[PDB]
Design an enzyme around this catalytic site. Structure first.
Site, PDB file in Angstrom:
ATOM      1  N   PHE A   1       0.816  -1.140   0.000  1.00  0.00           N
ATOM      2  CA  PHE A   1       0.000   0.000   0.000  1.00  0.00           C
ATOM      3  C   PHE A   1       0.902   1.260   0.000  1.00  0.00           C
ATOM      4  CE2 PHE A   1      -2.495   3.281   2.376  1.00  0.00           C
ATOM      5  CZ  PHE A   1      -3.595   3.329   1.507  1.00  0.00           C
TER       6      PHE A   1
ATOM      7  N   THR B 227       1.708   5.241   0.491  1.00  0.00           N
ATOM      8  CA  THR B 227       1.128   6.209   1.416  1.00  0.00           C
ATOM      9  C   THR B 227       1.407   7.670   1.029  1.00  0.00           C
ATOM     10  OG1 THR B 227       2.987   6.110   2.948  1.00  0.00           O
ATOM     11  CG2 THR B 227       1.189   4.523   3.303  1.00  0.00           C
TER      12      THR B 227
ATOM     13  N   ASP C 287       4.109   0.916   2.400  1.00  0.00           N
ATOM     14  CA  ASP C 287       5.271   1.689   1.942  1.00  0.00           C
ATOM     15  C   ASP C 287       5.271   3.167   2.260  1.00  0.00           C
ATOM     16  OD1 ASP C 287       6.559   3.438  -0.589  1.00  0.00           O
ATOM     17  OD2 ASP C 287       7.807   1.660  -0.090  1.00  0.00           O
TER      18      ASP C 287
ATOM     19  N   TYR D 158       8.046  11.630   2.977  1.00  0.00           N
ATOM     20  CA  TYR D 158       6.606  11.816   2.769  1.00  0.00           C
ATOM     21  C   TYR D 158       5.925  12.551   3.920  1.00  0.00           C
ATOM     22  CZ  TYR D 158       7.234   7.920  -0.607  1.00  0.00           C
ATOM     23  OH  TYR D 158       7.717   7.109  -1.642  1.00  0.00           O
TER      24      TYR D 158
ATOM     25  N   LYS E 105      12.350   4.878   4.023  1.00  0.00           N
ATOM     26  CA  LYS E 105      13.430   5.122   3.111  1.00  0.00           C
ATOM     27  C   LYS E 105      14.301   6.223   3.682  1.00  0.00           C
ATOM     28  CE  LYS E 105      10.171   4.103  -0.740  1.00  0.00           C
ATOM     29  NZ  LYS E 105       8.868   4.691  -0.142  1.00  0.00           N
TER      30      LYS E 105
ATOM     31  N   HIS F 209      16.652   5.920  -0.666  1.00  0.00           N
ATOM     32  CA  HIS F 209      15.488   6.435  -1.419  1.00  0.00           C
ATOM     33  C   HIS F 209      15.905   6.907  -2.837  1.00  0.00           C
ATOM     34  CE1 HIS F 209      11.390   8.637  -0.894  1.00  0.00           C
ATOM     35  NE2 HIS F 209      11.527   8.083  -2.102  1.00  0.00           N
TER      36      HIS F 209
ATOM     37  N   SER G  23       4.214   3.837  -8.632  1.00  0.00           N
ATOM     38  CA  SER G  23       3.477   4.571  -9.679  1.00  0.00           C
ATOM     39  C   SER G  23       2.986   3.512 -10.681  1.00  0.00           C
ATOM     40  CB  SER G  23       4.310   5.634 -10.401  1.00  0.00           C
ATOM     41  OG  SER G  23       4.652   6.638  -9.439  1.00  0.00           O
TER      42      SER G  23
ATOM     43  N   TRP H 294       6.129  17.644 -10.211  1.00  0.00           N
ATOM     44  CA  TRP H 294       6.834  16.366 -10.280  1.00  0.00           C
ATOM     45  C   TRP H 294       6.544  15.655 -11.576  1.00  0.00           C
ATOM     46  CZ3 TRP H 294      10.413  16.582  -6.747  1.00  0.00           C
ATOM     47  CH2 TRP H 294      10.137  17.344  -5.543  1.00  0.00           C
TER      48      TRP H 294
ATOM     49  N   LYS I 211      -1.353   3.054  -4.452  1.00  0.00           N
ATOM     50  CA  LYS I 211      -1.745   4.067  -3.492  1.00  0.00           C
ATOM     51  C   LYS I 211      -3.220   4.384  -3.766  1.00  0.00           C
ATOM     52  CE  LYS I 211      -2.983   8.536  -2.424  1.00  0.00           C
ATOM     53  NZ  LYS I 211      -4.051   9.322  -3.165  1.00  0.00           N
TER      54      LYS I 211
ATOM     55  N   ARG J  35     -10.288  -1.168  -1.119  1.00  0.00           N
ATOM     56  CA  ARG J  35     -10.836  -2.550  -1.144  1.00  0.00           C
ATOM     57  C   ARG J  35     -10.796  -3.196  -2.534  1.00  0.00           C
ATOM     58  NH1 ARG J  35     -15.945  -2.885  -0.180  1.00  0.00           N
ATOM     59  NH2 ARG J  35     -16.448  -0.649  -0.599  1.00  0.00           N
TER      60      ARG J  35
HETATM   61  N1  LIG Z   1      10.619   5.189  -4.078  1.00  0.00           N
HETATM   62  C1  LIG Z   1      10.178   6.186  -4.853  1.00  0.00           C
HETATM   63  O1  LIG Z   1      11.019   7.019  -5.484  1.00  0.00           O
HETATM   64  C2  LIG Z   1       8.686   6.409  -5.036  1.00  0.00           C
HETATM   65  C3  LIG Z   1       8.191   7.290  -6.001  1.00  0.00           C
HETATM   66  C4  LIG Z   1       6.800   7.424  -6.268  1.00  0.00           C
HETATM   67  C5  LIG Z   1       5.904   6.611  -5.559  1.00  0.00           C
HETATM   68  N2  LIG Z   1       6.410   5.676  -4.598  1.00  0.00           N
HETATM   69  C6  LIG Z   1       5.523   4.836  -3.741  1.00  0.00           C
HETATM   70  O2  LIG Z   1       4.555   4.192  -4.579  1.00  0.00           O
HETATM   71  C7  LIG Z   1       3.218   4.589  -4.214  1.00  0.00           C
HETATM   72  C8  LIG Z   1       2.302   4.529  -5.391  1.00  0.00           C
HETATM   73  O3  LIG Z   1       2.799   5.508  -6.289  1.00  0.00           O
HETATM   74  P1  LIG Z   1       1.897   6.832  -6.607  1.00  0.00           P
HETATM   75  O4  LIG Z   1       1.475   7.278  -5.262  1.00  0.00           O
HETATM   76  O5  LIG Z   1       2.877   7.616  -7.381  1.00  0.00           O
HETATM   77  O6  LIG Z   1       1.008   6.076  -7.664  1.00  0.00           O
HETATM   78  P2  LIG Z   1      -0.111   4.998  -7.943  1.00  0.00           P
HETATM   79  O7  LIG Z   1      -0.220   4.000  -6.849  1.00  0.00           O
HETATM   80  O8  LIG Z   1       0.262   4.668  -9.315  1.00  0.00           O
HETATM   81  O9  LIG Z   1      -1.318   5.914  -8.035  1.00  0.00           O
HETATM   82  C9  LIG Z   1      -2.497   5.517  -8.479  1.00  0.00           C
HETATM   83  C10 LIG Z   1      -3.447   6.747  -8.452  1.00  0.00           C
HETATM   84  O10 LIG Z   1      -4.555   5.998  -8.835  1.00  0.00           O
HETATM   85  C11 LIG Z   1      -5.680   6.097  -7.958  1.00  0.00           C
HETATM   86  N3  LIG Z   1      -6.215   4.763  -7.769  1.00  0.00           N
HETATM   87  C12 LIG Z   1      -5.847   3.840  -6.830  1.00  0.00           C
HETATM   88  N4  LIG Z   1      -6.609   2.710  -7.020  1.00  0.00           N
HETATM   89  C13 LIG Z   1      -7.381   2.905  -8.104  1.00  0.00           C
HETATM   90  C14 LIG Z   1      -8.329   2.094  -8.721  1.00  0.00           C
HETATM   91  N5  LIG Z   1      -8.661   0.931  -8.213  1.00  0.00           N
HETATM   92  N6  LIG Z   1      -9.088   2.636  -9.757  1.00  0.00           N
HETATM   93  C15 LIG Z   1      -8.823   3.901 -10.239  1.00  0.00           C
HETATM   94  N7  LIG Z   1      -7.868   4.692  -9.646  1.00  0.00           N
HETATM   95  C16 LIG Z   1      -7.173   4.202  -8.562  1.00  0.00           C
HETATM   96  C17 LIG Z   1      -5.217   6.764  -6.672  1.00  0.00           C
HETATM   97  O11 LIG Z   1      -6.143   7.835  -6.361  1.00  0.00           O
HETATM   98  P3  LIG Z   1      -7.112   7.699  -5.047  1.00  0.00           P
HETATM   99  O12 LIG Z   1      -6.218   7.786  -3.807  1.00  0.00           O
HETATM  100  O13 LIG Z   1      -8.069   8.855  -5.175  1.00  0.00           O
HETATM  101  O14 LIG Z   1      -7.741   6.303  -5.089  1.00  0.00           O
HETATM  102  C18 LIG Z   1      -3.785   7.199  -7.019  1.00  0.00           C
HETATM  103  O15 LIG Z   1      -3.702   8.595  -7.026  1.00  0.00           O
HETATM  104  C19 LIG Z   1       3.404   5.892  -3.449  1.00  0.00           C
HETATM  105  O16 LIG Z   1       2.248   6.229  -2.552  1.00  0.00           O
HETATM  106  C20 LIG Z   1       4.719   5.665  -2.706  1.00  0.00           C
HETATM  107  O17 LIG Z   1       4.570   4.853  -1.510  1.00  0.00           O
HETATM  108  C21 LIG Z   1       7.781   5.619  -4.323  1.00  0.00           C
END
Ligand SMILES: NC(=O)c1ccc[n+]([C@@H]2O[C@H](COP(=O)([O-])OP(=O)(O)OC[C@H]3O[C@@H](n4cnc5c(N)ncnc54)[C@H](OP(=O)(O)O)[C@@H]3O)[C@@H](O)[C@H]2O)c1
Ligand SMILES: NC(=O)c1ccc[n+]([C@@H]2O[C@H](COP(=O)([O-])OP(=O)(O)OC[C@H]3O[C@@H](n4cnc5c(N)ncnc54)[C@H](OP(=O)(O)O)[C@@H]3O)[C@@H](O)[C@H]2O)c1
Lengths: 322, 325
Positions: free
Chosen positions: B23, B25, B52, B57, B86, B119, B219, B229, B272, B280
């Site tokens: 998940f 965050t 995660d 963050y 991280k 990170h 992502s 970003w 996320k 869910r």
């Molecule tokens: N290590 C790194 O450099 C780094 C970089 C970027 C991200 N990350 C990690 O990866 C996570 C995920 O990346 P993200 O936050 O960039 O992107 P993501 O998980 O690709 O984001 C998906 C977007 O889609 C929406 N969503 C989620 N479930 C859905 C579904 N079932 N149907 C339609 N839309 C949906 C969410 O909006 P709602 O919340 O409105 O549902 C979210 O804004 C981050 O929270 C973070 O923990 C790490």
């Protein structure tokens, strides 16, 4: 310990992706299964595969109960599979067959109960009954009725999940499309390995969220007269051996890892304390996509286990394309 | 059925297990930090066992509380939560690594993190500011030997503060750099990087696999698309026609297809969402599977579209996205 790799079945239960096979040719003393299961557990197997027809449930159950009472493992951490033999397909014979397995095992339930083979034989003690002419005494049973009887064993709590074995596309559709179906099969346990990689059936199972469980994944027990001795030895394969060298593993390890990466739960039978340990090392490395492609190439459409002694009935599963 | 202590995990190269669905965050600045608390709770309730986060963050207090809350109420045990933080780039200097971990643990009120990652491979000057700038707005880059940083990470693991350690946003060269380090004690258990059908990381995936490193996809749903970003002209992944078609066929959603895709190529996938219904919905990724043709059809969407360049950190040699992979 405490954690291991499992997949979620379509009825909500989880199956460990590496299973330990317990069948051993007639010449091997049934006692060797007792120790082999104990070792398998010790090595980290959490999934144990047997069947009434392997005639080792007494021993297999003792091993399990023996690694339990010595706190080596907990009951919830053993995924135990049994199978309904073809002499008990009649609806009124299914629960009694499961209950006999459970009595032999001295366990309250099995984690999975499969219809071992879709062809039916005359009810009785003999597992392969034959007539005066030496021909098989086949019987005619509606598998839909057998499946309704398995659903009742899952509802009675005697089996956590139910599934099938040696079913083809046609037979799976028969169950999946059965009027009033309560529970889909969680798996279809079939022969599968680089020489017979079941790509078509695999994809079909995936499309219905049925897990394909691969047996004879290491090229089989090669027991005669079940398997042709002229058939290629899988583990001698040039490509497998090469990849085994590259990774500094073994051809067995490569054959197992292959199934894991294509979404297949894989069984592995060994009665060797050290090889039992080797096989659990499948969780220690990964294959690249080029390598997966190389193993895919090995497919020959050679089936080690035809079980063609059962050929003839409408439900003989290996005549179809898949 | 058995929302039990069973769920899908993979074995890491250090002997630990990682739940294959995480998940995410991070939420954009306009979203109040308080929302992270309820989100993580709902995520645990829904069946996520991997969470995660990161120091940068600015939600570890809330995320930590969520986790503590679900443990203290008996919903889950600590050993059934895989929590990741991280190390931010202002703490790459070896002597600052453990203090950074300890501060995150203080904020979280946890005894250990299950995984601590480097990170981002580009270092910035030590201090409280995560992106330290001089009076003219220039980012204050620092020169640090990541090999020394990793040694400090290894020590955090020997101390029990982190069960496992890994990296994020590392490329082929940086990975080799760590793996080929003299005296290397612990290989990274993972490389968390952007990954999705528009940027499927095929090459880097194979590399990691050949070293038994798990590639964790972030992502995976097309990112938070937060500006500045992410380029707002970038395609919306979840609007892809092929994804939509598959979603329709399976009676699922484009998001579900995208996540299942990763699981079936051996990638641990993050997702996320702060919406109770989508939270869910996402755990439904364990309810179906894709055929080899469907997989191939998703492989065909790859378009070299990187949503998250982090190019404000471009310039210094360790900037990871210039190399081919
Ligand atoms: N290590 C790194 O450099 C780094 C970089 C970027 C991200 N990350 C990690 O990866 C996570 C995920 O990346 P993200 O936050 O960039 O992107 P993501 O998980 O690709 O984001 C998906 C977007 O889609 C929406 N969503 C989620 N479930 C859905 C579904 N079932 N149907 C339609 N839309 C949906 C969410 O909006 P709602 O919340 O409105 O549902 C979210 O804004 C981050 O929270 C973070 O923990 C790490
Ligand atoms: N449902 C069905 O119709 C059906 C049919 C057949 C089998 N099965 C199930 O699947 C299980 C496995 O199938 P199998 O028993 O046919 O064949 P298998 O697992 O393919 O057999 C592999 C053969 O390889 C050997 N081996 C094991 N590990 C090895 C290693 N790492 N390196 C080199 N050799 C190794 C074993 O001999 P050693 O003992 O000497 O090590 C074994 O005889 C059976 O026990 C049974 O549970 C089900």
């Amino acid at each position: 310990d405490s954690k291991y790799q499992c997949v979620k079945l379509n009825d909500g239960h989880f199956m460990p992706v590496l299973g330990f096979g317990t069948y051993a040719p007639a010449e091997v003393p049934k006692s060797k299964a007792l120790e082999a299961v104990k070792l398998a557990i010790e090595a980290g197997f959490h999934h144990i595969d047997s069947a009434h027809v392997y005639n080792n449930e007494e021993q297999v159950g003792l091993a399990i109960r023996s690694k339990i009472a010595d706190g080596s493992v907990k009951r919830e951490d053993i995924f135990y599979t049994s199978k309904l033999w073809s002499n008990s397909h009649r609806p009124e014979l299914v629960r009694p067959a499961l209950e006999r397995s459970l009595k032999n095992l001295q366990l309250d339930y099995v984690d999975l109960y499969l219809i071992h083979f879709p062809v039916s034989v005359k009810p009785g003690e003999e597992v392969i009954p034959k007539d005066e002419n030496g021909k098989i005494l086949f019987d005619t049973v509606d598998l839909c009725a057998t499946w309704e009887a398995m659903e009742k064993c899952k509802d009675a709590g005697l089996a956590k999940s139910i599934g099938v074995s040696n079913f083809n596309h046609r037979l799976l559709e028969m169950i999946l499309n059965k009027p009033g179906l309560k529970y889909k099969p969680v798996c279809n346990q079939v022969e599968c390995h680089p020489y017979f990689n079941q790509r078509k059936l695999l994809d079909f199972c995936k499309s219905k969220d049925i897990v394909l469980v691969a047996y004879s994944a290491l090229g089989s027990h090669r027991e005669e007269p079940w398997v042709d001795p002229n058939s290629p030895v899988l583990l001698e394969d040039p490509v497998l051996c090469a990849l085994a060298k590259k990774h500094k593993r073994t051809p067995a390890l490569i054959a197992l890892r292959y199934q894991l990466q294509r979404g297949v739960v894989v069984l592995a039978k060994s009665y060797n304390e050290q090889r039992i340990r080797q096989n659990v090392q499948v969780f220690e490395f990964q294959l690249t996509s080029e390598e997966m492609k190389a193993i895919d190439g090995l497919n020959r459409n050679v089936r080690y286990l035809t079980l063609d002694i059962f050929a003839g009935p409408p439900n003989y599963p290996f005549s179809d394309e898949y």
